Each structure stands twice: as C-alpha cells, then as structure tokens.
Amino acid sequence: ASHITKDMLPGPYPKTPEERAAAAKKYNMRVEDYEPYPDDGTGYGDYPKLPDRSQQERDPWYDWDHPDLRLNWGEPMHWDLDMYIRNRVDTSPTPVNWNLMCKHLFGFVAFMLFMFWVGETYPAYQPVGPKQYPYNNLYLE
C-alpha cells in the first residue's frame, strides 16, 4: 500500500525540481542529467515525469560492475531507465558503421551476370566470332 508518488503523473513541468527527488530518485537534486525533463516529447502516450527513458542507455550488459551487483543481475535499488529489450543486447565494438557486407555480397553481383553464360567443358573459348559452332548443322552424309 504505497500511495505517495505511486506512479508518474501529468508532467513534465509541474515544478520538475520538486519531482526528483521528493520521491522517485532518478535525479539527486534535479541536476544529474536525469531530472524528469526527458519526457521525450509528450503529447503522445509516452512517459510523463516518468522515471523512465532518455537517461543513459543502450545497455545493461552484465559488466565487471563489482561496487554492487548493479549491472543486470542482482538488483540495484532504483535506477530504472528502460527494460525488456536489454537482457539480450550490447555496447560498441572496435569497428564502425561501414556496410561492407553488401559490397561483400556484391562479389557475386558481378558473377550474377556470369550466371547468364554457359559452362561447356571442351573445347576452349576462342571468343572472336561464330567459329565456335555449338550445335548440329549438317546431316550424316
């Protein structure tokens, strides 16, 4: 039976400094880069004061993270930003954006034109004219 600030309310400018943290301590003293200003853009059905989104994100990734359990497994107290998309997702590796795989898949895009050609073994190419003579022209005798 917790009624005092039991959820978010119609924010985000009903004295937003008195939101964090009279309750729902997402910010310490409303200057922590996590004061409840980040109502994305409102008007929609997004989050209001919402101890919620655009706080620092893209991974809880089960780090070394020893000062508490605190990464994803072992319940830090009150730091909820977003959930249900992160038990299977990660941070940035050493390479960067470069979509070389479509260029890597473009290696057969040159040979996709080679799929129109034929594959007879003998004789050799001699690609100069109609002297190759593929099929039957004349009769037996």
Partner 1 sequence: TTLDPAEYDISSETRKAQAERLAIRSRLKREYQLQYYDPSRRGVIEDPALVRWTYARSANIYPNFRPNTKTSLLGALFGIGPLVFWYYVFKTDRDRKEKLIQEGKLDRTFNISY
Partner 2 sequence: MLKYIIPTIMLMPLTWLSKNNMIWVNSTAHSLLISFTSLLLMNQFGDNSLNFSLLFFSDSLSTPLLILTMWLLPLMLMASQHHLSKENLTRKKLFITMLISLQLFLIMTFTAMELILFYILFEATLVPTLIIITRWGNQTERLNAGLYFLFYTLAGSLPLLVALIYIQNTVGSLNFLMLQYWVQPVHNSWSNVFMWLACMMAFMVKMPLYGLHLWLPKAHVEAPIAGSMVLAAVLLKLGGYGMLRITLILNPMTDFMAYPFIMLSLWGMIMTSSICLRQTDLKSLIAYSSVSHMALVIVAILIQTPWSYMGATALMIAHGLTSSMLFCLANSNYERIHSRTMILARGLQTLLPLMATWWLLASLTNLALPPTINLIGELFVVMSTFSWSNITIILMGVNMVITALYSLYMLIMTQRGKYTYHINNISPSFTRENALMSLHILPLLLLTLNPKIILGPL
Partner 3 sequence: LTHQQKVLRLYKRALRHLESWCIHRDKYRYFACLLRARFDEHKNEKDMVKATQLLREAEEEFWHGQHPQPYIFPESPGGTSYERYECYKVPEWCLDDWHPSEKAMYPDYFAKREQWKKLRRESWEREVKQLQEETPVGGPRTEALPPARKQGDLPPLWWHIVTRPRE
**Residue 40: contacted member of partner 1, partner 3, partner 2, none (CB under 5 to 8 Å, by partner type):** none
Exposed, middle or buried by CB within 10 Å (0-12, 13-18, 19+), for 68?
A: exposed
* Residue 92 vs 99, nearer CB to partner 3: 92
Instruction: Give the nearest distance from C-beta 87 to partner 1 in angstroms.
Output: 15
Task: Give the CA dihedral 124, 127, 129, 135, nearest 10 degrees.
Answer: 40
Binding of partner 2 by 73 (CB under 8 A): yes
**Residue 62: contacted member of partner 2, partner 3, partner 1, none (CB under 5 to 8 Å, by partner type):** partner 3
Instruction: Give the nearest distance from C-beta 136 to partner 3 in angstroms.
Output: 58
Binding of partner 2 by 75 (CB under 8 A): yes
Strand residue runs (E) in the chain: none
* Residue 57 vs 63, nearer CB to partner 3: 63
Q: Which helix (H) or strand (E) holds 111?
A: helix 107-111
- Site map (CB under 8 A) of partner 3, residues 39-78, x = contact: -----------------------xxx--x-----------
Contact predicate 8/16, CB 8 Å: no
Exposed, middle or buried by CB within 10 Å (0-12, 13-18, 19+), for 62?
A: middle
* Residue 69 vs 112, nearer CB to partner 2: 69
